[PDB]
Design an enzyme around this catalytic site. Sequence first.
Site, PDB file in Angstrom:
ATOM      1  N   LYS C  16     -93.581  18.767 -29.302  1.00  0.00           N
ATOM      2  CA  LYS C  16     -94.447  18.902 -28.075  1.00  0.00           C
ATOM      3  C   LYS C  16     -95.823  19.767 -28.714  1.00  0.00           C
ATOM      4  CE  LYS C  16     -91.521  17.248 -25.493  1.00  0.00           C
ATOM      5  NZ  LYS C  16     -91.864  16.033 -24.609  1.00  0.00           N
ATOM      6  N   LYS C  42     -88.435  14.272 -33.476  1.00  0.00           N
ATOM      7  CA  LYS C  42     -88.912  12.767 -33.232  1.00  0.00           C
ATOM      8  C   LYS C  42     -90.384  12.748 -32.673  1.00  0.00           C
ATOM      9  CE  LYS C  42     -87.848  10.626 -29.506  1.00  0.00           C
ATOM     10  NZ  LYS C  42     -88.737  11.114 -28.463  1.00  0.00           N
ATOM     11  N   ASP C  44     -92.955  12.124 -30.044  1.00  0.00           N
ATOM     12  CA  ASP C  44     -92.794  11.944 -28.572  1.00  0.00           C
ATOM     13  C   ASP C  44     -93.000  10.395 -28.445  1.00  0.00           C
ATOM     14  OD1 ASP C  44     -93.710  12.110 -25.634  1.00  0.00           O
ATOM     15  OD2 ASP C  44     -92.937  13.981 -26.045  1.00  0.00           O
ATOM     16  N   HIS C 135     -86.117   4.442 -27.403  1.00  0.00           N
ATOM     17  CA  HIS C 135     -86.665   5.305 -26.075  1.00  0.00           C
ATOM     18  C   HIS C 135     -86.770   4.069 -24.940  1.00  0.00           C
ATOM     19  CE1 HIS C 135     -89.148   7.622 -23.423  1.00  0.00           C
ATOM     20  NE2 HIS C 135     -88.242   8.381 -23.655  1.00  0.00           N
ATOM     21  N   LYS C 175     -83.825  17.532 -16.094  1.00  0.00           N
ATOM     22  CA  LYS C 175     -85.020  17.199 -15.383  1.00  0.00           C
ATOM     23  C   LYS C 175     -85.176  15.931 -14.586  1.00  0.00           C
ATOM     24  CE  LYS C 175     -88.581  16.450 -18.956  1.00  0.00           C
ATOM     25  NZ  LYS C 175     -89.537  17.382 -20.010  1.00  0.00           N
ATOM     26  N   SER C 220     -81.735  13.832 -23.246  1.00  0.00           N
ATOM     27  CA  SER C 220     -83.069  14.400 -23.687  1.00  0.00           C
ATOM     28  C   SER C 220     -83.756  14.578 -22.455  1.00  0.00           C
ATOM     29  CB  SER C 220     -83.858  13.634 -24.648  1.00  0.00           C
ATOM     30  OG  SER C 220     -85.090  13.924 -24.747  1.00  0.00           O
TER      31      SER C 220
HETATM   32  O1  RUB Z   1     -90.034  13.967 -23.101  1.00  0.00           O
HETATM   33  C1  RUB Z   1     -88.868  13.946 -23.591  1.00  0.00           C
HETATM   34  C2  RUB Z   1     -88.026  15.320 -23.787  1.00  0.00           C
HETATM   35  O2  RUB Z   1     -88.598  16.628 -24.281  1.00  0.00           O
HETATM   36  P1  RUB Z   1     -88.191  18.115 -23.668  1.00  0.00           P
HETATM   37  O3  RUB Z   1     -86.927  18.004 -24.255  1.00  0.00           O
HETATM   38  O4  RUB Z   1     -89.187  19.077 -23.854  1.00  0.00           O
HETATM   39  O5  RUB Z   1     -87.841  17.819 -22.184  1.00  0.00           O
HETATM   40  C3  RUB Z   1     -88.191  12.786 -24.307  1.00  0.00           C
HETATM   41  O6  RUB Z   1     -88.884  12.412 -25.261  1.00  0.00           O
HETATM   42  C4  RUB Z   1     -88.077  11.471 -23.321  1.00  0.00           C
HETATM   43  O7  RUB Z   1     -89.284  11.313 -22.681  1.00  0.00           O
HETATM   44  C5  RUB Z   1     -86.799  11.847 -22.398  1.00  0.00           C
HETATM   45  O8  RUB Z   1     -86.740  10.752 -21.430  1.00  0.00           O
HETATM   46  P2  RUB Z   1     -85.262   9.820 -21.214  1.00  0.00           P
HETATM   47  O9  RUB Z   1     -84.259  10.455 -22.000  1.00  0.00           O
HETATM   48  O10 RUB Z   1     -85.057   9.632 -19.699  1.00  0.00           O
HETATM   49  O11 RUB Z   1     -85.709   8.468 -21.768  1.00  0.00           O
END
Ligand code: RUB
Lengths: 123, 123, 316, 151, 467, 467
Positions: C16, C42, C44, C135, C175, C220
């Site tokens: 991030k 990884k 983003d 993803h 979240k 995640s």
């Molecule tokens: O943004 C994040 C998590 O970062 P953080 O740990 O700071 O929240 C991931 O790259 C995916 O978007 C998760 O989405 P999903 O698992 O629903 O595909």
Amino acid sequence: MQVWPILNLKKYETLSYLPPLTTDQLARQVDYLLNNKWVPCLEFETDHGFVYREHHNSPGYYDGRYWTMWKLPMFGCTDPAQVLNELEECKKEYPNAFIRIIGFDSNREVQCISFIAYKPAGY
Amino acid sequence: MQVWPILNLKKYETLSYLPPLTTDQLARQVDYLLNNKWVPCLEFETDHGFVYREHHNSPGYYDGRYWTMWKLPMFGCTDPAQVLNELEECKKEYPNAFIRIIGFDSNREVQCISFIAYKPAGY
Amino acid sequence: DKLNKYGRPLLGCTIKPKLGLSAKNYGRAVYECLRGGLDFTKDDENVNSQPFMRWRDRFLFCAEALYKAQAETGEIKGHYLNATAGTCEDMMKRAVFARELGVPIVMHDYLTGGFTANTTLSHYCRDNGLLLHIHRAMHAVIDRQKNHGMHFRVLAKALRLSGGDHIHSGTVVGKLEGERDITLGFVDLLRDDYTEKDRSRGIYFTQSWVSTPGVLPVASGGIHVWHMPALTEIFGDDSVLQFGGGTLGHPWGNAPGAVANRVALEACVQARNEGRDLAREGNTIIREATKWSPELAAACEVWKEIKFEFPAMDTV
Amino acid sequence: ASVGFKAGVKDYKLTYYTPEYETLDTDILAAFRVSPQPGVPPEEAGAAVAAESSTGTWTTVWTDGLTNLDRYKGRCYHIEPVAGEENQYICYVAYPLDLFEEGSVTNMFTSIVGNVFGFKALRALRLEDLRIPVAYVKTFQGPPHGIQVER
Amino acid sequence: ASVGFKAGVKDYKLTYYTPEYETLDTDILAAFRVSPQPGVPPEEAGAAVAAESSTGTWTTVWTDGLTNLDRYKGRCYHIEPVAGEENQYICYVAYPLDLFEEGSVTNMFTSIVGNVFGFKALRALRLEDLRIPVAYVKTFQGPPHGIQVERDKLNKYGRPLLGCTIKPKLGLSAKNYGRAVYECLRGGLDFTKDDENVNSQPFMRWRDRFLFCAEALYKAQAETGEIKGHYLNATAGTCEDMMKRAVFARELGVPIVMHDYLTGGFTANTTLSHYCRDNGLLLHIHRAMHAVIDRQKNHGMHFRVLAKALRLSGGDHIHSGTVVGKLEGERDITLGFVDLLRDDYTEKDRSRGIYFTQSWVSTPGVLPVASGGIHVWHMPALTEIFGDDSVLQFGGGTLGHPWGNAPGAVANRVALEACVQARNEGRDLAREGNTIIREATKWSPELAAACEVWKEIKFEFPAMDTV
Amino acid sequence: ASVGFKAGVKDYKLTYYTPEYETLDTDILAAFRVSPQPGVPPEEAGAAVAAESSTGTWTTVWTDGLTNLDRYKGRCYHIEPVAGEENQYICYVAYPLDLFEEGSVTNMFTSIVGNVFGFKALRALRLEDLRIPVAYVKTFQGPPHGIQVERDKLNKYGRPLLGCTIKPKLGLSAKNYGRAVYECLRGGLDFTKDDENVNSQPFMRWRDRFLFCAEALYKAQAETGEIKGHYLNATAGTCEDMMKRAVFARELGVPIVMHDYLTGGFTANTTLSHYCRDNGLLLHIHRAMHAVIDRQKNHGMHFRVLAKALRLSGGDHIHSGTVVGKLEGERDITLGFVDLLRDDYTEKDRSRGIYFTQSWVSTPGVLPVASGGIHVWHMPALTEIFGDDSVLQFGGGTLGHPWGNAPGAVANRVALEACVQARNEGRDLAREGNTIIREATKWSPELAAACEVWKEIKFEFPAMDTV
Ligand SMILES: O=C(COP(=O)(O)O)[C@H](O)[C@H](O)COP(=O)(O)O
Ligand SMILES: O=C(COP(=O)(O)O)[C@H](O)[C@H](O)COP(=O)(O)O
Ligand SMILES: O=C(COP(=O)(O)O)[C@H](O)[C@H](O)COP(=O)(O)O
């Protein structure tokens, strides 16, 4: 705020970030392995304690992953005392080696357990 | 005419060809960093003090460029005493390491400053 | 087997801010995270190639960073280099450079990239020994509402067929939305070889896989140290737990942020293995660990009362 | 100036609701029909959408300081309530040109539509329109031929 | 509505002088310094220039009716007389985005600068500036890496970079080239480079040179602990040959190659810029032949236009002149195009020759390279004119040192750091330059000797191109 | 013998003014028109030019000792003052064969014209001519085909060839382009061509144009019984793109493509010249941007140097100016470089601007192309200036005809043959031109109309570059 140390901070995968295992703690891991009906096996290594790449560097290739088998996997073992004893036999024979206990799940053909049980001097 | 020496003549980029920095000179570099409103950060390294190539040799790839961060970049710092103090904390903790002070310009996302602040024995 | 990792869920971390970091800063962040105990870091999902950081530069610096953390710790490390791109050609160039670097894992957004390109990448990865992290960007546009769309379990089965070694599966407690029973159901559809019809978990048909390899579910999104016991218990060992903000949000930096997560996980693994109830004893397990891990204590300090509990839109 | 790093979570609206923002002609603009969960105010809903579809995450990360976040952040610059709607708004989000890979619809969707529709804090979300800047339009081939050439 | 076709010739101003036109933000704007032949009014001169560089020809053609000419025509939207000039004006021309091929500097020049400079009706013509619309900027890759990435790959921060062209220009063998390269680099220079005319010749074939230079640079790097590079010249007679050279450099794992964008050409240069992006090679650009084009104030193309074009095509470094060296380069004009090369936004500023506000939408910045008749005493002025983000090169200033290449390099490296330290401490490089240098000679025998040798060598002549 | 190394700067004339030097027949000779700054003597000016364009730099470098500098140095062997000139001389410089990369015009220019034009010590500099040694000439392919082969492939003999640039320059769609091309060709023109700035754009993508133009030219050819061609422009932003275009043209089986050698560049041009030789495609060369370089008498490079360079790199046609049209081109100077382009031997002749006797050792000749503001009334002068071996192009002069393209083409074709017949019968084109044209209008309605339209259109301005 602390600065995470850099020197002599080699780790050993599962459980290696926790405080050292006590006799009891070690015993409980062996119990866990046997309760799940996994086959225990001991592996030791003295030359290359960590992964390296001497013979190839293509994706997924590393040297150092294979250690050497102590005897054979303890098929049908249900007594943790047998495991711990073999660990003692291995240690007396290879006090210079790193020794780990692994547990096989033959149905999945995957090691569901693996932790370092002994580390030679200076480790 | 002199012959430029060959042995033990490793350099450390910016300012490394000048005489050693005095307390005052070091202080003035920190001031310069802060006056330009750059974020100071300390980095230390003890294992690989110079660039090398162990994992790859394609254009632009070198190992040794990354050192390890001391704590975090000092965001919002305006007191050079804070920097110099962290340099002392780092030195007591890593007297065996090379330590450098860098300064980030977040607008350009480039280090506008970088100089060696401490070198371990024999350097 | 390739990673020589057994007995615990794997740990990851998304770098991030999502967008905006330079290639060298990305590697810098990646090295600090990995040296602390995380198995992976990884890209983003929206980090492909952009004016602020071109991909080859990132792949290059990230390789330098991961190899450095690996040599320092003695544990195999990986960084999901994103091969998602605008065309199959570009996507392939990225997979190809990753192969050249000898790194173990790349990633792809199967829905925004598409099934055609994803299948092409899945085959390349099989042909070149690269692990493929998948993803699911855009899935909730499709699978959120109960009345219209396609349930994620269908999108998950499709991905297992096309091909992927990991697939984001939600966190349940984080979240973003994800009911536990429904999640446990599709996690079984992703990892196992046979799953019997079970409407209580949203499984309408008994599904057999004739040995199609299982996919590792990746939790995640809004998770942190206090969630570790629930995560370990919901998913078990065969999962990857990722903490981006939960690592880069630590007050002491990335390395301590990683140590915190790694210590929390092993504390939960040890407790579970000793017979403790992760559900009832979670907070105690975590709390005990803070007693000997300054790093975990600080993280715990920071996120002690952060929960994400809203009414779900899609239930059984 | 730089301000210290303060770990912890805070409202997204603190950084991502920017009602006074004048959009750049190079920005990609999005019109989202937002249906917030009860207790979630429009500003925070629109801000959560702008944040998580661009540069932000759930807690404060120190790395923002290595960059110029205001240069990159997506931002909710306007919110209009939906007529006849019970708790539904049209939140407009602006995304800087630099956030997207040239010529990649795949990258554009991954950002704008990638994770926000699954937010626990929202009941529903619909992307109604996108204003694609001409500077981004020019990074694409567009139709292989087009109407005139085809006829 | 359509009007009938009326064959025959008519004034260009009837269609191409459009003083009321408000420029579109997608237009490419051109500032032409027009010197009309006697009897040719400014409006018709500016209109003839707009017409023939875009959609029109000398007589009326019926085919205009198949299109929407006003949608496509370039147009002279403003004319300003040149102060102190006898029959000379600055005519501004606007060209619609649709007139140009995406990503092709070649196409852009072919239109704007293709046939108008030879008009019988004009005495002279100079293209002073181009406002490149951000929608067109985005169709280009721009530099393969750019300033930030380059410092990051090289791990070099806080001071200008140091280079050195190997001399004599032509005539050295491959092994002697490497020998000279090793001595230079081990002394503290960051780079050494092939002289621009060193491509492949009977006295030294390129592959042999690339090979020996790689051995030499790797040796200097291991000895000093600092990343080193040597610009291996990929300039060649064909694209194929050029590529073979870029390819061998990639195989050697070296960080930087070079190309002569004007003598090699924009088409080949763009091909090389992409290859370098694809293979992580830094691209140093030399501007051989530019003064044939940009020297005179009355006719040609100002270098700032050639510099913007290179930033678009792609290059990580570009020779930008020295201001104080052996070749011409006015300070204000130079400072202006240096900003156009490194920054993301530059506001119109006629005092520096900037006729249009130019935005780059994050196209990476190019590092200006000062080279040509410079030496240690010039260091303070160079550091102050260019700042950290520049490469200062000393060929003769290194290989002309009385003690050899290594000490020659030490002299330049010490002089630069002395200036960097002084500047950082608050000293005025302009007022204190000689003192800063002089102080350093007190502890650096190498600098002292160099100083001894070039103490009163200056290059001060009247400039031909001024604001 | 070797003499010690003496660091420091000294006059270039000490090593580079060599008035007693007899040139080798393997040397490349250059005739530079030098305008020194006040206080700079001719000898030092000529020597500075010889030094910096070959082996020397501003201060003495020890490395010269590793070589045999006199074997490699370029040298000013003669200086002649310019009549009627205030401080201007013609300095002749000789460059040893070993200094140049075989077959690379790019390398040749990088040396001779690379940095000397920007010397602070010079006010201005113009390269007027180059004597290319036959040993260097043989390292080049030269034109892919040349005059003899071209007439043979096209089965065209006994008259200049006729062309036409499609207008408006930019803005037409692909289908409209083909439509215009078919009408032009069916009327009697041998070729039609993409305007030089037509590459690939939003209003018309290249492949679509190549495709429609092939349909159009094949239709005109079947209708008339004469081989037709349309110069498909391969000029592009990268070598790759350029090649894709040459490749599609090959696939279509058409006889000719075109390239802008200066905006595209010598490196890409040489790559295209070879491809064309390898695939039997005729290469028409446009000189966009040349006047930016060759217009002024005091500074730049004369077109004759750019023309010789193109003959070396390779091209089957080259725009050479019209003399009587809208762009500048003096007759004697033009006749001179036209000979340098088409013939095998040309003796020094200062009245035509030829400073050196030039031999070509059978390098094929290039067909000069007259295009730009010409029409039917100019036909007699054009036929007489250039003779049969030229291509006369009428874009506006065809698409500006009141009856459309086909009649516009008939007008030009009839005018040309009328002039060819008259000339062959012994008539004086210069004295009898208007009568020859006028007689033809009596039996050709098409020519009459064209004549009606352009009867009093002339382009007569004072030339900037004279002998
Ligand atoms: O943004 C994040 C998590 O970062 P953080 O740990 O700071 O929240 C991931 O790259 C995916 O978007 C998760 O989405 P999903 O698992 O629903 O595909
Ligand atoms: O000749 C030199 C400099 O050598 P020296 O340091 O010995 O003078 C360079 O290679 C370029 O030609 C500079 O020209 P520009 O910077 O104007 O492109
Ligand atoms: O514009 C024209 C001629 O069209 P028209 O016949 O309508 O004048 C040509 O394409 C070249 O530009 C000639 O320039 P040069 O011959 O000097 O290269």
